[PDB]
Design a protein around this motif. Structure first.
Motif, PDB file in Angstrom:
ATOM      1  N   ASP A   1      11.758   5.475   6.776  1.00  0.00           N
ATOM      2  CA  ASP A   1      11.693   6.869   6.198  1.00  0.00           C
ATOM      3  C   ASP A   1      10.269   6.889   5.760  1.00  0.00           C
ATOM      4  O   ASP A   1       9.922   8.166   5.341  1.00  0.00           O
ATOM      5  CB  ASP A   1      12.628   6.732   4.859  1.00  0.00           C
ATOM      6  N   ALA A   2       9.522   6.023   5.331  1.00  0.00           N
ATOM      7  CA  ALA A   2       8.077   6.399   5.010  1.00  0.00           C
ATOM      8  C   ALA A   2       7.343   6.946   6.336  1.00  0.00           C
ATOM      9  O   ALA A   2       6.736   7.904   6.293  1.00  0.00           O
ATOM     10  CB  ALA A   2       7.488   5.168   4.572  1.00  0.00           C
ATOM     11  N   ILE A   3       7.689   6.568   7.312  1.00  0.00           N
ATOM     12  CA  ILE A   3       7.291   7.066   8.739  1.00  0.00           C
ATOM     13  C   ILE A   3       7.703   8.318   8.903  1.00  0.00           C
ATOM     14  O   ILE A   3       6.888   9.157   9.494  1.00  0.00           O
ATOM     15  CB  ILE A   3       7.513   5.893   9.793  1.00  0.00           C
ATOM     16  N   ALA A   4       8.929   8.704   8.614  1.00  0.00           N
ATOM     17  CA  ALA A   4       9.565  10.014   8.926  1.00  0.00           C
ATOM     18  C   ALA A   4       9.067  11.060   7.986  1.00  0.00           C
ATOM     19  O   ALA A   4       9.066  12.097   8.406  1.00  0.00           O
ATOM     20  CB  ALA A   4      11.037   9.769   8.301  1.00  0.00           C
ATOM     21  N   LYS A   5       8.375  10.744   6.758  1.00  0.00           N
ATOM     22  CA  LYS A   5       7.617  11.596   6.103  1.00  0.00           C
ATOM     23  C   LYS A   5       6.037  11.631   6.266  1.00  0.00           C
ATOM     24  O   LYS A   5       5.376  12.088   5.430  1.00  0.00           O
ATOM     25  CB  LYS A   5       7.955  11.217   4.606  1.00  0.00           C
ATOM     26  N   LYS A   6       5.773  10.744   7.324  1.00  0.00           N
ATOM     27  CA  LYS A   6       4.174  10.751   7.544  1.00  0.00           C
ATOM     28  C   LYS A   6       3.337  10.099   6.257  1.00  0.00           C
ATOM     29  O   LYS A   6       2.430  10.812   5.967  1.00  0.00           O
ATOM     30  CB  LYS A   6       3.589  12.066   8.263  1.00  0.00           C
ATOM     31  N   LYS A   7       3.873   9.109   5.559  1.00  0.00           N
ATOM     32  CA  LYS A   7       3.188   8.639   4.642  1.00  0.00           C
ATOM     33  C   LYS A   7       1.979   7.723   5.006  1.00  0.00           C
ATOM     34  O   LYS A   7       1.972   7.226   6.143  1.00  0.00           O
ATOM     35  CB  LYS A   7       4.182   8.026   3.727  1.00  0.00           C
ATOM     36  N   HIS A   8       0.909   7.571   4.165  1.00  0.00           N
ATOM     37  CA  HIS A   8      -0.272   6.815   4.542  1.00  0.00           C
ATOM     38  C   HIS A   8       0.135   5.327   4.824  1.00  0.00           C
ATOM     39  O   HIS A   8       0.745   4.892   3.928  1.00  0.00           O
ATOM     40  CB  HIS A   8      -1.479   6.933   3.590  1.00  0.00           C
ATOM     41  N   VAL A   9      -0.251   4.760   6.108  1.00  0.00           N
ATOM     42  CA  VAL A   9      -0.051   3.470   6.087  1.00  0.00           C
ATOM     43  C   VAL A   9      -1.243   2.501   5.448  1.00  0.00           C
ATOM     44  O   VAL A   9      -2.266   3.147   5.773  1.00  0.00           O
ATOM     45  CB  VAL A   9       0.159   3.195   7.583  1.00  0.00           C
ATOM     46  N   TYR A  10      -0.810   1.403   5.039  1.00  0.00           N
ATOM     47  CA  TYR A  10      -1.582   0.433   4.636  1.00  0.00           C
ATOM     48  C   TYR A  10      -1.302  -0.959   5.145  1.00  0.00           C
ATOM     49  O   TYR A  10      -0.634  -1.126   6.199  1.00  0.00           O
ATOM     50  CB  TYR A  10      -1.381   0.105   2.926  1.00  0.00           C
ATOM     51  N   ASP A  11      -2.581  -1.833   5.211  1.00  0.00           N
ATOM     52  CA  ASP A  11      -2.535  -2.960   5.969  1.00  0.00           C
ATOM     53  C   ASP A  11      -1.891  -3.994   5.224  1.00  0.00           C
ATOM     54  O   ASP A  11      -1.748  -4.524   4.341  1.00  0.00           O
ATOM     55  CB  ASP A  11      -4.042  -3.287   5.615  1.00  0.00           C
ATOM     56  N   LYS A  12      -1.027  -4.672   6.221  1.00  0.00           N
ATOM     57  CA  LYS A  12       0.189  -5.682   5.849  1.00  0.00           C
ATOM     58  C   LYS A  12      -0.707  -6.931   5.207  1.00  0.00           C
ATOM     59  O   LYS A  12       0.081  -7.688   4.340  1.00  0.00           O
ATOM     60  CB  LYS A  12       0.823  -6.304   6.873  1.00  0.00           C
ATOM     61  N   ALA A  13      -1.999  -7.183   5.411  1.00  0.00           N
ATOM     62  CA  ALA A  13      -2.584  -8.355   4.886  1.00  0.00           C
ATOM     63  C   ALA A  13      -3.042  -7.958   3.305  1.00  0.00           C
ATOM     64  O   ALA A  13      -3.668  -8.795   2.962  1.00  0.00           O
ATOM     65  CB  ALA A  13      -3.947  -8.452   5.702  1.00  0.00           C
ATOM     66  N   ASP A  14      -3.036  -6.683   3.198  1.00  0.00           N
ATOM     67  CA  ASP A  14      -3.193  -6.558   1.766  1.00  0.00           C
ATOM     68  C   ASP A  14      -2.077  -6.556   0.640  1.00  0.00           C
ATOM     69  O   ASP A  14      -2.142  -6.687  -0.473  1.00  0.00           O
ATOM     70  CB  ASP A  14      -3.779  -5.165   1.353  1.00  0.00           C
ATOM     71  N   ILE A  15      -1.118  -7.196   1.189  1.00  0.00           N
ATOM     72  CA  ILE A  15       0.300  -7.696   0.665  1.00  0.00           C
ATOM     73  C   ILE A  15      -0.209  -8.572  -0.218  1.00  0.00           C
ATOM     74  O   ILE A  15      -0.586  -9.776   0.455  1.00  0.00           O
ATOM     75  CB  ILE A  15       1.526  -7.706   1.479  1.00  0.00           C
ATOM     76  N   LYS A  16      -0.140  -8.776  -1.524  1.00  0.00           N
ATOM     77  CA  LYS A  16      -0.285 -10.078  -2.067  1.00  0.00           C
ATOM     78  C   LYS A  16       1.152 -10.662  -2.398  1.00  0.00           C
ATOM     79  O   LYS A  16       2.133 -10.156  -2.979  1.00  0.00           O
ATOM     80  CB  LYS A  16      -0.933  -9.827  -3.358  1.00  0.00           C
ATOM     81  N   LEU A  17       1.353 -11.955  -2.199  1.00  0.00           N
ATOM     82  CA  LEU A  17       2.434 -12.596  -2.171  1.00  0.00           C
ATOM     83  C   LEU A  17       2.405 -13.590  -3.230  1.00  0.00           C
ATOM     84  O   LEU A  17       1.395 -14.460  -3.483  1.00  0.00           O
ATOM     85  CB  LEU A  17       2.895 -13.536  -1.062  1.00  0.00           C
ATOM     86  N   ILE A  18       3.415 -13.691  -4.363  1.00  0.00           N
ATOM     87  CA  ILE A  18       3.364 -14.479  -5.223  1.00  0.00           C
ATOM     88  C   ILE A  18       4.572 -15.354  -5.491  1.00  0.00           C
ATOM     89  O   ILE A  18       5.710 -15.148  -5.303  1.00  0.00           O
ATOM     90  CB  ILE A  18       3.288 -13.743  -6.664  1.00  0.00           C
ATOM     91  N   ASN A  19       4.237 -16.778  -5.652  1.00  0.00           N
ATOM     92  CA  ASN A  19       5.283 -17.837  -5.970  1.00  0.00           C
ATOM     93  C   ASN A  19       6.272 -18.080  -4.828  1.00  0.00           C
ATOM     94  O   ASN A  19       7.454 -18.007  -4.964  1.00  0.00           O
ATOM     95  CB  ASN A  19       6.047 -17.455  -7.063  1.00  0.00           C
ATOM     96  N   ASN A  20       5.691 -18.013  -3.471  1.00  0.00           N
ATOM     97  CA  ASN A  20       6.526 -18.346  -2.308  1.00  0.00           C
ATOM     98  C   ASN A  20       7.484 -17.305  -1.940  1.00  0.00           C
ATOM     99  O   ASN A  20       8.497 -17.621  -1.511  1.00  0.00           O
ATOM    100  CB  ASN A  20       7.125 -19.758  -2.348  1.00  0.00           C
TER     101      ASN A  20
END
Ligand code: NA
Lengths: 201, 167, 200, 201, 200, 200
Positions: E103-122
């Protein structure tokens, strides 16, 4: 002897005090007082109406026997106040009979009475007596348990036979225990398993 | 045969039968006694297929397309109070009578198993085949009464099994 | 037998007009239902059952039930109520105030709006539920350890052990019945274990 | 001679007249015609494709015998026009089978066909025949009950074997039996117990 | 009103400098989006909405949304957020973190880099995507045919079979444990069937 | 707003000598830090912070924070502490007692010795930490493999093994009871397999 929670008895104006109404209240018990029966057909040839009388529906909490209740209301009103007390088995119908509107009174062409003359006493709520809600079912279940312990009842047939013989002593019918043990069959299995082991001891 | 029926048409003459009904924005018809569905479908047509209902609640809500079949493919959910109800029809009525006949029938099935010491569900089924009508019982309807009470069933049959060997 | 959560009924015809405010005087947390004046009746002639209130009552310590009988009759009027029952599942009785228990709702019965519930003295439903489950969980863990220690082979042996020593472990027959209800599969495992262990 | 209302059969272009669609409509019965099945791989050696054929979904007006319809279409379309007249138990699976979209068809990865080539006759509407899953699970169950009784099937392996041999006669496959008896295993235990003791008689 | 997967917004303007570390303190796994500093703003004007993070938050057991809101409010401030929302599809919410859900893609929303996802506590998304109804029954049916084919009399025999030949059928011990949980009555019927069949 | 886990500081300068015994008076479990006598201070020229203890305090029921502060004021002096903080992850604060928390290590705070923790009123950290469902599911999968490995025929054999070796696999009796609750059907299949497998 026969033990139940619901009872009934008759009162006659001529042989009880004028204040009887309030002295009934002294007991703190739920009661339904029928309209006065001054237009009942008399079995005596040559007589028109039976002696004017009231029907009284009497509700204890802990199940009590018949003589107990006869004893306290006799003490309450005078010894010339009453004779016997009936144990009521379908209170819903006995409540209807107070107006001669039960499925049998309307069936035998008995004089009908006005339901507005029914006086309820001490928060008599007829609906709580025909339903037996969860708290009652838990107490009934615990009773069934003690019966299976006491008499080492090995299966549900032995239990059923015992209820047939002695059901009323503890206020139990077969159709009642079916309702009480419904959804508790795993518990029932544990009891019967225990009883079974106990009887080859 | 059953008491609850459904059918579909593409007002007063329906009341002429004096029989409870509930007409959607599909029509639901409640017989006065358990009766066959072919019979009912002869009667309406002379008035102006028909499928027997095994659960009322779901079809009441289908007159809105609002139950699990509906949520499975939710479409075109219909009005609620816009329903023609003749001959004093209400839903509380018929579901609580469903319950009472369930327990009704369950208790008589218990007494049968006791009376004739039925040891297993085959012996019970056989008894229904021969004597079912005298107690108002068929194989499929005993199936529906004892569904969800199989632990109760096992208790009963265990009893009968061991009483039979007392003799 | 001592318990923490209680309930009873009140009918408008039997209580003074200030009953709600007199109730909060007693300084105990309480939940009062909306007036059930549209409860559908089984008697075939009175449409709706007697309009009534359900009251949820929680003592702070485990207390006697007739104690609770004593105080409310005193404070509200002796023609107000007759018996106090004891709640075993506050979850369902709290929802039953609104006919939102699963079990009562499964038997239908009229629903009422939970905004018509009045709570007294900061009645916290979430606190009494959470303390009920972890207290009952421990009673169960206690029952487990008794079945291990004394190799109790079935539920009759456990009942006997309760009669002899119930008070020592804060256990009564009726109280184990509530603890083990809905855990009979676990019970079966324990007795099976004890049984084989006693054949060693 | 088994009589039911829903039928299906094959039609061969090779052996049917040019105006066959208009001739079918005259019978005045609702009908669904599959897209021409010209790409079904054939188990006969050396030919690789089955003879091009149509599947016909047939809904009679009232209960009728299978040969009844065979005759009606032979005299209407030709002597060799059709083959394999068959009584249908679930109309929805046949309609899906028309395009090889029955889950049982896709489970064998049968060639899928275009649903737009389905021809409807006399206003055949599939929604008019679909059943609720709850009730189908109930009748399928009652069927399984009847098989276990009839053939004294003592356990679920015997039932599975019977389904392997004779499932289609009753519209049953292993995986659909698994769905039907899911959440009814307590009932199943009662049946197998019954069958077990009955076979020791 | 209790769920395990939650999400909420955080704006750098209204949160402490060490917020990332304070979040870790709670001991619950969570996925943090890349800074959303380029979302086309529906006010037009400033083109972009104020920079914010999305947080995917996984409670240890089911909790209310207010549980979570209260916790973040205590940890980060009353100003840090207004509502925590309940997530129904963890995978879409994870993809929304970078505007890559369908649905984000369906509204042409700005895409961000999956490597900037910060993961916390496994936090590992694959751990929370589970138990497809369609797959759980197909694995079940496979287990059935194995019990039929190899006449497996009990759960030990089944487990031994999985250890030796699991790979052939896409099966591990723990994955069978998931498949049969809550079908043990069915399992019993199968093993009884096998048991009697092996005494023929 | 009311919570169960709390912490606060105590400064030797501002507290009585018998303060440790005075804390035991309350009957609440508590964890006391090793004295932080070597914390590096942001005050120019002072080197170390004032020697202080962190106290981890476990309230008996949900309680307000100010309640706990006042009660510590009455016990130790009004000058004993200033504010009481709500602990959100009880495990994280306990590690903070020695600056062995992940946020302490991230800020390079001085590490202290774990033997200098003073526990009060049977404080056990493992009773306050909570496990997520993924962790409870693996604990079950662990119990399965234990029943397989050691062919445990019944739940007594299982408990005995947990008594002997529970810690090796992170297991206690009561935590086994939680893990298998509602899985007793699976349990029976396991024990049956072990039982038949031992007659072989
Ligand atoms: Na008063």
């Amino acid at each position: 002897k026969e033990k139940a929670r619901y009872f009934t008895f008759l009162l006659y104006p001529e042989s009880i005090p004028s204040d009887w109404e309030l002295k009934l209240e002294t007991l703190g018990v739920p009661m339904a007082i029928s309209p006065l029966h001054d237009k009942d057909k008399s079995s005596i040839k040559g007589q028109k109406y039976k002696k004017a009388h009231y029907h009284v529906l009497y509700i204890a909490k802990n199940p009590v026997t018949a003589d107990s209740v006869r004893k306290k209301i006799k003490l309450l009103l005078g010894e010339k106040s009453l004779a016997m007390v009936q144990v009521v088995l379908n209170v819903e119908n006995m409540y209807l009979y107070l107006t001669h509107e039960s499925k049998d009174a309307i069936a035998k062409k008995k004089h009908v009475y006005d339901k507005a003359d029914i006086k309820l006493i001490n928060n008599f709520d007829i609906d709580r007596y025909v339903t037996l809600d969860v708290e009652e079912k838990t107490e009934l279940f615990n009773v069934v348990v003690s019966l299976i312990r006491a008499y080492t009842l090995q299966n549900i047939f032995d239990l059923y036979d015992f209820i047939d013989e002695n059901g009323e002593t503890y206020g139990l019918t077969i159709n009642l225990v079916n309702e009480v043990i419904a959804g508790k069959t795993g518990f029932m299995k544990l009891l019967f398993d225990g009883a079974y082991q106990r009887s080859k001891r």
